[PDB]
Amino acid sequence: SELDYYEKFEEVHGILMYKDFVKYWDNVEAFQARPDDLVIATYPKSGTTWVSEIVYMIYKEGDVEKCKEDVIFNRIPFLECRKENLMNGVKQLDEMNSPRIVKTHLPPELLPASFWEKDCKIIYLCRNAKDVAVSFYYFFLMVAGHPNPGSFPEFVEKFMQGQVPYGSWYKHVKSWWEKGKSPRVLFLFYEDLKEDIRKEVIKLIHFLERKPSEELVDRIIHHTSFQEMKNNPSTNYTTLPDEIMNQKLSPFMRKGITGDWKNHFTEALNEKFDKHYEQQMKESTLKFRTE
Ligand SMILES: Nc1ncnc2c1ncn2[C@@H]1O[C@H](COP(=O)(O)O)[C@@H](OP(=O)(O)O)[C@H]1O
Ligand SMILES: Oc1c(Br)ccc(Oc2ccc(Br)cc2Br)c1Br
């Protein structure tokens, strides 16, 4: 188990990471941004796919046909991702026509310097830690390249210690929260998109300097709803073989709610998690909602 984690993950810049990504990290380090690049940054399982498709629709002015020209992981490359010669974020971005949309899970300190130098806009999305933990747990189960996460309480213990890919959720959100004070960084909450999607969609349109209209806004809302994205082969990862993502164990578009932690955390695990959480987050103005 601890052996299993050792075979699967390695630290880069002090951050635990998928071994396959780390082998070619120089390519990520030296990545060349363009001024009009748009970065979408999230801790894993925080709703990256959701905000990505919303952003893509705003770029394509709500043209759904244009959003299905290829699967989402080809339309919006995963920056640091690398599967030897099978998948390559940096390569996919290099060959791309601008404007590029870049997916990443990196904490601000690990983001390639070029993005900061060229002052690229960044959208950061976060989600309450308990729901993230649940989603990440099933992800470990479904996706190749992860160790056996064991029981859920055992996994949550690794989560609390930041011993999962991309490290501590606590440090991630807190570091990005500081960056969010910049005008170039828009800080969003998964729970806010659940609560009032129209409000956040209009917020996104204004941030990307586009014109808001009811028709465009309406098209984004139903196109990016959970049920639609779950049924969309462009966005639900079902074009991937089971040996890579086995959605028969658990679909990528799993439940899409806030509060699934209530269905997994025991009373004791919740008490332990909450206590640890208060200590990690006490000195921060960042406040989440678990419901
Ligand atoms: N349109 C949508 N509406 C609500 N939740 C969505 C969504 N698209 C993806 N998600 C949720 O976001 C999580 C995946 O995150 P990511 O895209 O960062 O990998 C999954 O959470 P759950 O496992 O709780 O259902 C998934 O269901
Ligand atoms: O958000 C993701 C995280 Br975190 C980790 C992996 C991944 O996709 C993959 C799923 C299986 C393999 Br083999 C390589 C990749 Br990348 C995604 Br999307």
Ligand code: NA
């Ligand atoms: Na800001």
